[PDB]
Amino acid sequence: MIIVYTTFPDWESAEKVVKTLLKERLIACANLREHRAFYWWEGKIEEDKEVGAILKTREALWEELKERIKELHPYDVPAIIRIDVDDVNEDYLKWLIEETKK
Amino acid sequence: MIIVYTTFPDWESAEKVVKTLLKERLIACANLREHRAFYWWEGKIEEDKEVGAILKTREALWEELKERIKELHPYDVPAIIRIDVDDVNEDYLKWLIEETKK
Amino acid sequence: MIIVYTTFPDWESAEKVVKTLLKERLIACANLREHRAFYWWEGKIEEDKEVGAILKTREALWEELKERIKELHPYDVPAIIRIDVDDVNEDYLKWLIEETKK
Ligand SMILES: [Cl-]
Ligand code: NA
């Protein structure tokens, strides 16, 4: 399995996106939590309060998921970061696989 | 070293497990923080407030830690996610190795 | 690219250090959020509130970033954990590369 990390400007946009992904079976679970983002933007550093989203799904769904996220994300150029999970307990993997599309 | 990520239903169960893993020195450190989980639960999309736990330990203790977490975890099917650390400052690593069981 | 995870004792230090890293063009973005740390220290399990920081930058800047963080961090032995990003949307990578020093 893999985790995909992306961030949102608020809870409504974040929840809408994750629920849409769940409905479309592109991810099995999402963990959302707030954070303060500090970053470079057009010549100056910006500070925004965001909602980070840790998505859990299959490596086989990475490409499809990445493209779907692009279509749904409020940011024109959002962060869609893939970090592979080296290993996970068999019972959880079984669940994640059953809950996601082939 | 590796990072192990798992979620708990509340702060009480989270702290209990983490303190036990620490006492038994299966991990050297844990970072807990709340988040909102969204997932499929046998036919429907559920939402739950959880406490996520980021555990820091060594590769060699993965199997034993995974098994111990299974025994202590409040969920019958918990998420026990292993993500290897590609690199870390040598003095922190020495500390982590020294604090965990050999 | 890579994500670097480090923790701070408070927001003052967390913000000062991440902004310095941003201004020295060693990272493009940083996501900070509080968490509760539980860890072994000199024979006792300590507990402390911390500000965790997720830094995003180029793989090529790892060593410089690691050394710079060591030189700026309030902790004598901080956690400087590097986790490689297996893949990311090219549009974001383009921006990240453009915002970090060459
Ligand atoms: Cl996190
Ligand atoms: Na990896």
Instruction: State the binding site of B.
Output: 48
For residue A37, give the nearest of C31, C83, C87 by CB distance: C31
CB contact under 8 A, C45 and B28: no
Under 8 Å between Cβ of A62 and A1: no
Segment holding B44, helix H or strand E = strand B44-57
- The alpha carbon of B72 and the centre of ligand 1 are apart by a number of angstroms equal to 23
Resolution, Å (one decimal): 2.0
What the block records as the tokens of A64 is 């499809």
Q: How many domains does chain C have?
A: 1
SS3 call for B10:
coil
Rounded CA separation C5/C10 (Å)? 15
Radius of gyration of chain C (CA): 14
The 3 state secondary structure assigned to chain A is CEEEEEEECCHHHHHHHHHHHHHCCCCCEEEEEEEEEEEEECCEEEEEEEEEEEEEECHHHHHHHHHHHHHHCCCCCCCCEEEECCEECHHHHHHHHHHCCC
Report d(CA B29, CA B22) in Å as an integer: 7
**Could you tell me which of A76, A74, A83 has the C-alpha nearest to residue A14?**
A74
Helices B11-23 and B62-72, axial angle in degrees (round to 10): 140
What SS3 state is found at C15?
Answer: helix
Amino acid (one-letter) located at A35: H
Residues 6 or more apart whose CB falls under 8 angstroms from that of B60 comprise none
- Angle of helix A62-72 relative to helix A11-23, nearest 10 degrees, comes to 140
Cβ separation of B89 and C83 shorter than 8 Å? no
Kindly list the residues of chain C whose beta carbon comes within 8 Å of any beta carbon in chain A. 1, 3, 15, 18-19, 22-23, 28-33, 54, 56, 83-89, 91-92, 95, 99
Q: Can you tell me whether residue B22 is helix, strand or coil?
A: helix
Measured between CA atoms, how close is C33 to chain B, in angstroms? 9
To the nearest whole Å, the CA of B39 is away from the closest chain A CA by 4
The whole-angstrom separation of Cα C80 and Cα C38 is 17
Specify the experimental method.
X-ray
Numbered residues of chain B with Cβ closer than 8 Å to any chain C Cβ: 1, 3, 15, 18-19, 22-23, 25, 28-33, 54, 56, 83-89, 91-92, 95, 99
Whose structure tokens read 């409020």?
A74
Name the residue in chain B with its Cα closest to that of C64: B89
Residue in B42, B37, B31 with CA at minimum distance from that of residue B9? B37
Residue position matching structure tokens 């203790």: B61
Structure tokens given for B80: 């026990």
- Tokens describing residue B75: 């969920």
| Per-position DSSP letters for B54-87, written without gaps between them | EEEE-GGGHHHHHHHHHHH-SSSS---EEEE-SE
Under a CB-based contact definition with an 8 Å cutoff, are residues A100 and A93 in contact?
no
Cα nearest neighbour of B27 on chain C: C39
What residue numbers bound the domain in which B14 lies?
A: 1-102
Q: Which long-range contacts (C-beta less than 8 Å, at least 24 apart) are formed by A44-47?
A: A45/C19, A45/C22, A45/C23
Hey, are the CB atoms on C22 and A33 less than 8 Å from each other? no
- Tokens representing A13 are 């946009």
For residue C41, what are the CA distances in angstroms to A90, A96, B44? 33, 37, 44
CATH number at C59 reads: 3.30.70.120
Q: 């072994």: which residue's tokens?
A: C40
Give the integer Cα–Cα distance in Å for B99 and B29. Answer: 9
Report phi then psi at C101, rounded to 5. Answer: -65, 150
Q: From the CA of C7, how far away is ligand 1's center (Å)?
A: 11
Answer for the pair A2, A88: CB distance below 8 angstroms, yes or no: no
**What ligand has the least distance to the C-alpha of C86?**
2
Cβ contact (<8 Å) for B82 and A83?
Answer: no
C48 is in an annotated binding site: yes
Q: Is residue B33 within 8 Å of B71, Cβ to Cβ?
A: no
